[PDB]
Design a protein around this ligand. Structure first.
Ligand SMILES: [Cu+2]
Ligand SMILES: [Cu+2]
Lengths: 661, 661
């Protein structure tokens, strides 16, 4: 058989060979049809099949490839599965009223089409840009998001237009006032949204940020600062076997796909010989960046980056020394292009360990701290950085030596901007960050998808709220009124889980195994979600934003596990009106399904609300976002105590050294 | 004159010479009186005097020393001021119904007194410890906090008793059931709180954490991990002139005192030649760690560490390479002992710079990210670590290159523990973290004191709440219901400022200068407090905890500036019942005073609520806490753009290098 070679691990992404094998198979199946490839990626094995293979000597799951194609002259898409071993299409269906994720190829041609469009050219002339300077006009190709004038009838993009006085300028200080709508398949402008109040191109200098620009703007650059060198002469402590990582007792598979980007699977912790499962899969499953200006056509700015462009497709090849400093281990990403040929993104993921301050410390005041023990912490970082036109999303999955797992995100890049008239007030929907530049308010929301396996199978979730004792001050039960406890509300049905972060109770959430008990505390083993950057969805109920991102309405959504329940806003996000039972809305159903002690899926909504300020322009300083999953009642004691201390002196040793007591 | 030499800077802490000069002066003034020194510290110059001296060629402020002494046979204390230049007491008063901060000397003798007390010995015997093994009994000397049976009539301490089978053990796995009350001045036990239900000493092995213990507990220690070396071959970029720091345009004075520990003053940022003030003073002014068990005598566990022991007095001498890694610059601390002689704590503060990931980045998708600019961030850290008996508080004041200032705190050390009977349930007020060990619930709350001078004098504060537009979905004003803005509520009077963090609006607070305007945004320059770890005070209104820490009831308290308005729970905290108009309660008054565009003081309450778990025992992994002050509308653009990029390639350069276009 010409079947491609099987991977080392069932969860390994498709190899370039498998991708090509998949596309050859699809092409043969659709022989005579003019088709193009939109997506060719690994169809992960069923959860049960994988676990049986992994721990019960079960059979090796079939190596499958999921594909999405377009056929010239045919509406929507066609999707299906290819069994790589037998090189055959085993599943396929047409979806004529849906539009797929926009690939780099899908987006690359838009700029040239608007530049050569007569209606667009006329608009540029009207805006103060001569027809013979169209090479100075640029545009960020966006999914149209959703426009009720066309639905999914045509595959559309909207173009946010900008102007560069010089090719090296940062165009964002000079947005134009109109918005062209482009037919992706036909590669032509079908309409242009033009404001009632016209604003011609800004005549100010561009707000630039490269050194040559800064030298002109301010005196010059600051002197090169003294270097801070990081070296690991004896190598690193982590061990990579293919995509399998081993570090500080943690063991997991590092996967990656066009959409979610990094995908961490089969996460376990070796508790002194007892290898205990934690999570079967964890990743970012969707996002939405809803803008806050009510004015047309700005309601169309609420990109669901992961589902509409792909955190994988948009990922940057990481530059050693700059993006990832120190001794780095890189991983590449493989996708398919429109023709069905494998494409590779080098250094899409970087892995390394860093010093992370103190892990723990304690000194005895009795001998003036002579008795002391200090142990420094080391963290393991698995990261990627993707670019969504103007913004940059830096993602860092962090593993720590106390057994905690953290997701750190840094937002940078450039503010989305729209033109502002000389006599126009930007507030309250935006900020004038530069003359004639309006940076609209917006939120950055993410959907963390957790498939738990806390110390094994059979899990539950709960909200934990800190509360004062119900007994009043002066009562026998709370004489001095200081009593307080943690109220744990275990979610029984899906409906019970739809909860938001609450500052009034310093709310946290537990993902636990009700089938086990901690021998000391008597509480079930668990990982606690500690997350406070949980903005409420500001768009109203029934709004386009709320309908297309049903998951964003609550900080936490817990539903029964089902295979292929990955994307909360549906499988094909672009141009979906938000009407219909799909994604999270489908999984929630009538909210009556059991989620207590069974296989569950935990979707957490977190992020920030951004009100632009001049400090964010013309290039924005990194803004941090973070959440953490901590083991609570999982271990019987601090799991990092067997790590060699950086310094340690006992009381007896102190007496000896001290002098002679 | 024998007056001690003046310091280089008016805000420099008292030198050992000044301390001795101060105590000699006080002793002479109280000639014939048997006095002891409790506190001898710098009395900082009036805010106005300092600023006039600093920017208006005003006279050098008088060098003053504040002292607190006890007189044998006299109730309370005596406090006053010494004018160092003239070596004379210029101010003095007796406070007979107050008790002062407990010094290391005040606390060091308690353990020996209980060991030799007959009533205590009897209790140990009754608890299962032979009278001839009292050398195995230990106790953490605590302020009694407040006990209505004695008020401030006697200076008291309460002793949390523990047992060590071996001097090298960590005693916390073996607490005893009773609590001795000791007269600090008389050095004798005056009472012992004994529970109705007796619990004899635990017979389990001690829960230890040193390597030798771990080798016995688990197989052995983990192998020494490969080193991660940090070097700065060409030195550091920051410059210290005495206590004056200069780094990345920031300039400030690093002070330190027995109580607040680190005190950062006169903070400014050099905005390309324009030196702009930010804060006149910032520090931690008080804390409270209220425990949540209602059972007697646990209501007495709500230590206000800063005001009752002193973050300075408790600070650890930092060990190079372990506590502070890299090229470090240290500062020492100087206090007075009971006799009036200067005492020194070496390396009380460490200063250094660290790599802090990416400062900002952006790449153009047009040439597959060939056009890119990446600049790494460096942060300046000013830190200290103090020990409060069982806990360790690691404090890190962080300055960043985007102009933001952050306060990072890591809590470590050991859990406060009380005995648990074999048949005793710890919940809901605590957790059984080890056999017979009950770790009670508690909160860790801090009072950040900010004396702002945002871009000059005349400041205001406000709450910022993210809100959806009031207009409904489908209205002409909010057609698609996505509109949202930031509602700014400027505090007019003190009463308006008493606010809490609100997750429902992702609340932040602004400290701004209403006298100035950002030329681009049209908003006043400001520093925004972004802080989400703001627990509500769980102790009830009218409770001992709420009364002694009036500031902890709100996340934010803003009052008019007045000289010497430093400590929110009063100047002499130990044993105050919480009744009376002092500290924050006095500053708030009837809440009608103006705080809009004037000299204000901003007190922020933040921290965490701790529900112990076995992972925290026997030694707890560092738990993080953080808050940030960001410039918003302060600058007209990202202030870090003139920093040499780690990597930078323009579109034109990319074309040249790319190949040849
Ligand atoms: Cu943003
Ligand atoms: Cu704690």
């Amino acid at each position: 058989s010409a079947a491609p070679a099987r991977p080392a691990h069932p969860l390994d992404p498709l190899s370039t060979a498998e991708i090509k094998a998949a596309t050859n198979t699809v092409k043969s199946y659709f022989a005579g049809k003019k088709i193009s490839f939109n997506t060719v990626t690994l169809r992960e094995p069923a959860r049960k099949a994988y676990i049986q293979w992994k721990e019960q000597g079960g059979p090796l799951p079939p190596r499958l490839a999921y594909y999405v194609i377009l056929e010239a002259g045919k509406p929507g898409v066609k999707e299906g599965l290819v069994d790589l071993a037998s090189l055959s299409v085993i599943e396929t269906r047409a979806l004529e009223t849906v539009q797929p994720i926009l690939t780099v190829e899908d987006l690359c041609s838009t700029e040239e089409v608007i530049r050569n469009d007569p209606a667009v050219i006329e608009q540029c002339v009207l805006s103060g840009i001569p027809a013979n300077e169209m090479h100075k006009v640029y545009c960020d190709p966006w999914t149209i998001g959703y426009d009720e004038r066309w639905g999914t009838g045509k595959r559309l993009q909207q173009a946010l237009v900008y102007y560069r006085s010089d090719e090296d300028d940062s165009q964002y200080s000079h947005p134009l006032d109109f918005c062209p709508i482009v037919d992706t398949e036909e590669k032509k402008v079908i309409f242009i949204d033009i404001p009632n109040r016209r604003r011609k191109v800004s005549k100010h200098k561009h707000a630039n940020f490269y050194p040559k620009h800064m030298i002109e703007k301010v005196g010059a650059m600051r002197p090169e600062a003294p270097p801070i060198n990081v070296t690991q002469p004896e190598g690193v402590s982590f061990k990579m076997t293919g995509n399998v990582m081993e570090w500080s007792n943690f063991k997991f598979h590092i996967g990656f796909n066009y959409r979610e980007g990094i995908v961490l699977s089969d996460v376990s912790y070796n508790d002194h010989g007892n290898v205990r499962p934690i999570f079967h899969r964890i990743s970012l499953s969707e996002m939405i960046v809803p803008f806050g200006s009510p004015e047309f056509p700005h309601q169309r700015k609420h990109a669901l980056d992961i589902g509409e462009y792909g955190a994988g497709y948009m990922t940057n090849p990481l530059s050693l020394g700059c993006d990832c400093k120190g001794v780095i281990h890189y991983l590449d990403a493989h996708f398919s292009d429109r023709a069905g040929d494998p494409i590779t993104v080098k250094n899409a993921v970087c892995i390394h360990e860093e010093d992370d301050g103190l892990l723990f410390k304690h000194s005895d005041f009795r001998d003036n701290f002579a008795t002391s023990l200090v142990t420094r912490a080391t963290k393991l970082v698995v990261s990627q950085i993707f670019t969504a036109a103007n913004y940059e999303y830096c993602l860092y999955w962090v593993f720590m030596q106390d057994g905690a797992i953290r997701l750190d995100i840094r937002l940078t890049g450039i503010l989305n901007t729209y033109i502002l008239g000389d006599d126009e007030e930007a507030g309250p929907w935006g900020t004038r960050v530069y003359p004639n530049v309006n940076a609209h308010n917006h939120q950055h929301l993410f959907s963390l998808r957790i498939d738990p396996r806390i110390d094994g199978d059979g899990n539950s979730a709960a909200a934990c709220d800190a509360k004062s004792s119900p007994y009043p001050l002066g009562s026998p039960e709370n004489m001095y009124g200081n009593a307080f406890y943690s109220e744990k509300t275990t979610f029984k049905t899906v409906k019970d889980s739809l909860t938001n972060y609450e500052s009034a109770t310093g709310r946290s959430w537990d993902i636990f195994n009700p089938n086990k008990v901690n021998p000391y505390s008597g509480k079930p083993p668990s990982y606690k979600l500690v997350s406070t950057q949980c903005p409420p969805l500001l768009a109203k109920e029934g709004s386009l934003v709320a309908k297309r991102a049903p998951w964003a309405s609550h900080s936490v959504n817990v539903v029964p596990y089902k295979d292929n329940r990955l994307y909360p806003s549906g499988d094909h996000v672009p141009q979906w009106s938000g009407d219909g039972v799909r994604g999270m809305r489908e999984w929630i159903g009538d909210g009556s399904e059991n989620i207590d002690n069974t296989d569950i899926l935990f979707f957490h909504t977190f992020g920030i609300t951004h009100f632009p300020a001049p400090e964010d322009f013309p290039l924005m300083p990194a803004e941090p976002i973070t959440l953490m999953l901590r083991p609570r009642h999982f271990f019987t004691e601090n799991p990092g105590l067997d790590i060699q201390p950086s310094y340690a002196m006992t009381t007896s040793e102190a007496k000896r050294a001290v002098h002679k007591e």
